[PDB]
Design a binder for this molecule. Structure first.
Ligand SMILES: *[C@@H]1O[C@H](CO)[C@@H](O[C@@H]2O[C@H](CO)[C@@H](O[C@@H]3O[C@H](CO[C@H]4O[C@H](CO[C@H]5O[C@H](CO)[C@@H](O)[C@H](O)[C@@H]5O)[C@@H](O)[C@H](O[C@H]5O[C@H](CO)[C@@H](O)[C@H](O)[C@@H]5O)[C@@H]4O)[C@@H](O)[C@H](O)[C@@H]3O)[C@H](O)[C@H]2NC(C)=O)[C@H](O)[C@H]1NC(C)=O
Ligand SMILES: *[C@@H]1O[C@H](CO)[C@@H](O)[C@H](O)[C@H]1NC(C)=O
Ligand SMILES: *[C@@H]1O[C@H](CO)[C@@H](O)[C@H](O)[C@H]1NC(C)=O
Ligand SMILES: *[C@@H]1O[C@H](CO)[C@@H](O)[C@H](O)[C@H]1NC(C)=O
Ligand SMILES: *[C@@H]1O[C@H](CO)[C@@H](O)[C@H](O)[C@H]1NC(C)=O
Lengths: 210, 49, 226, 52
């Protein structure tokens, strides 16, 4: 259902509706950010409610053979979301489908360096016969990040749980790495290290039992 | 796809440029120029004339 | 107007589903109310809508499994999806529907059609369909150099999502970052929420992480200290 | 309307109705009510010359 759309930082972007109207139409447009509520961009082909900046526009229905198109001009990193096209024409009837989504991706964003923070297993966790190392990566772009764990000088392969990259409220991606161990394996090695790799750069923090 | 028409869609088998060859074509007709063939009733029709 | 949903969170398949939507900012017997959902890996699926005459109209793709009703005694909107399976795991939104009349000719000839557009939405509620029971997380304080230090709480092993993490109610607002959860191989979720705290404030100011795992439901208070 | 020409014989071309492009709207005629009522009144004045 996802329609990939590659655009740059604030260029001219044309979002064409997947369905073409068979007659007089009344197109609705919705902006949906992952994890948020849908936002009504354009209703009745071209009208927009208050609160919508003068960036989103629709194509009017003047009987011309013009396809419905969502006209977003000058996208920011805050417009990177999915877009649905709700088509209503006199010939299709009651349309229950919002159709496929056009997932907008904004490129040309300045490269950001990941801020890594590593935490050792808590003391209340050791007494519960558990041990987990939490490695928090955030404030980086693009989302391509490779996280690796190493015990002393040997790379750990099992027990690593890593999340998928996802942007946050600052329009930058954030990830998390969880290395679950045992109280006897945590105190076995002298030191552990969370090593991440972003855009070829390699940064790393280190914890040790104390 | 309208719920609750003056024209019907009528598909039929028609003769071609060749005699042995027959084609199936679709054409729109008005309800006033077409009456049902069975009134029993199905959805089979014929021309009024 | 304002809308907010409340849901049990997780129920076993092949029984009965019931969610509620509390309206705010207008009359409930005054508008057309609809429900929208969105499953992981799927788009927005329209469920149905109810009129001001308390007449309903459901999406035929749900196979008549949905029922919407109004309750003016409490100004609440209700949706029941009845017997569902794992494919109905979605985020259910309640919204306001305005009916527009698109005219393209003579009114007497019915040369017009109605269309519904949703202008006001709610934040949605997370619903998961599994055969296991809920599990409460046992969180642990992550004890805390550039002038600031890292201060977080390790919300470990819970099911299902989500978890709302607050710090000192309204006192700590920035920089408080709650990282997204991780789906472990055992089917348990875990997240972490760190706060950037100056070094001089440690030992003088107190900090607590309010963990809200409403679908479980759980609450673990932890006073993080170095 | 659109013209859908389908050959039904050597040189015989039957022109049928193709799919209507746009909206389905039945035909109608508009007559000014102010003019028709006025004209109709001028008629009944001459009808009363033959019916009382
Ligand atoms: C024989 O006579 C017939 C009967 O008069 C005639 O049939 C008429 O045909 C015309 C042309 O096809 C149709 O007009 C059509 O109207 C639609 C709808 O647009 C209309 O919108 C408003 C009403 O909506 C308002 O309220 C809602 C909320 O309820 C708002 O959301 C909305 O935004 C509006 O605010 C209506 O007032 C408009 O009329 C004004 O504006 C126009 C544009 O400026 C002016 O030209 C007009 O004089 C007036 O100031 C507007 O009509 C439109 O989308 C279509 O494009 C089309 O224009 C008539 O509906 C239809 N019936 C009647 C009763 O008029 C036949 O055409 C005529 N001839 C034949 C051969 O049959
Ligand atoms: C199809 O057209 C006939 C002709 O009048 C009508 O009676 C019938 O209701 C139409 N079909 C449906 C499903 O309405
Ligand atoms: C056309 O011929 C085929 C084969 O005999 C038959 O199945 C079909 O019903 C015919 N169609 C019409 C409209 O007569
Ligand atoms: C018919 O169309 C003409 C176009 O010039 C217009 O002047 C006239 O008022 C119309 N009359 C009616 C009855 O629609
Ligand atoms: C016709 O004209 C007469 C005279 O003014 C008036 O009383 C009557 O109401 C009119 N009727 C219509 C249908 O316009």
């Amino acid at each position: 259902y996802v329609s990939p759309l590659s655009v740059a930082l604030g260029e001219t972007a044309r979002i064409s509706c997947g369905r073409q109207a068979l007659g007089s139409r009344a197109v609705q447009w919705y902006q949906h950010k992952p994890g948020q509520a849908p936002i009504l961009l354009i209703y009745n082909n071209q009208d927009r409610p208050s609160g919508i900046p003068e960036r989103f526009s629709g194509t009017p229905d003047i009987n011309f053979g013009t396809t419905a198109t969502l006209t977003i001009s000058g996208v920011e990193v805050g417009d990177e979301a999915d877009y649905y096209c709700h088509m209503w024409d006199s010939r299709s009837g009651f349309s229950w489908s919002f159709g496929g989504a056009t997932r907008l991706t904004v490129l040309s964003q300045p490269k950001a360096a990941p801020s890594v923070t590593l935490f050792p297993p808590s003391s209340e966790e050791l007494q519960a016969n558990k041990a987990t190392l939490v490695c928090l990566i955030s404030d980086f772009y693009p989302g391509a990040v490779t996280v690796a764990w190493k015990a002393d000088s040997s790379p750990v392969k099992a027990g690593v749980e890593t999340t998928t990259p996802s942007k946050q409220s600052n329009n930058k991606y954030a990830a998390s790495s969880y290395l679950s161990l045992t109280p006897e394996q945590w105190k076995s090695h002298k030191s552990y290290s969370c090593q991440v790799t972003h855009e070829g750069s390699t940064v790393e923090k280190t914890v040790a039992p104390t | 796809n309208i719920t609750d028409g003056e024209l019907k869609n009528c598909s039929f088998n028609m003769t071609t440029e060749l005699r042995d060859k027959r084609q199936k074509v679709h054409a729109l007709f008005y309800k006033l120029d077409i009456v049902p063939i069975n009134e029993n009733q199905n959805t089979s029709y014929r021309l009024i004339n | 107007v304002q809308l907010q949903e409340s849901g049990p969170g997780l129920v076993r398949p092949s029984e009965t589903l019931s969610v509620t939507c509390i309206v705010s900012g207008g009359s409930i017997s005054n508008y057309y109310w609809t429900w929208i959902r969105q499953s992981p890996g799927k788009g927005l699926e329209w469920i149905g809508y109810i009129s001001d005459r308390e007449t309903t109209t459901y999406n035929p793709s749900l196979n008549s499994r949905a029922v919407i009703s109004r309750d003016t005694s409490k100004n609440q909107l209700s949706l029941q999806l009845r017997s569902v399976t794992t494919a109905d795991t979605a985020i259910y939104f309640c919204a306001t529907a305005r009916r527009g009349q698109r005219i393209y000719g003579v009114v007497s000839f019915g040369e017009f059609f109605y269309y519904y557009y949703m202008d006001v939405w709610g934040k949605g509620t997370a619903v998961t369909v599994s055969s296991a029971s809920t599990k409460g997380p046992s969180v642990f304080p992550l004890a805390p150099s550039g002038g600031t230090a890292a201060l977080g709480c390790l919300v470990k092993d819970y099911f299902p999502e989500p978890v709302t993490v607050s710090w000192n109610s309204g006192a700590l607002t920035s920089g408080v970052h709650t990282f997204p959860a991780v789906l472990q191989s055992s089917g348990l979720y875990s997240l972490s929420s760190v706060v950037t705290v100056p070094s001089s404030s440690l030992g003088t100011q107190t900090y607590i992480c309010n963990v809200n795992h409403k679908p479980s439901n759980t609450k673990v208070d932890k006073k993080v200290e170095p | 309307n659109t013209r859908k020409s389908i050959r039904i014989g050597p040189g015989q071309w039957f022109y049928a109705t193709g799919d209507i492009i746009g909206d389905i709207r039945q035909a109608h005629c508009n007559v000014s009510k102010a003019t028709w009522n006025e004209t109709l009144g001028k008629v009944v004045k001459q009808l009363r010359k033959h019916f009382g």
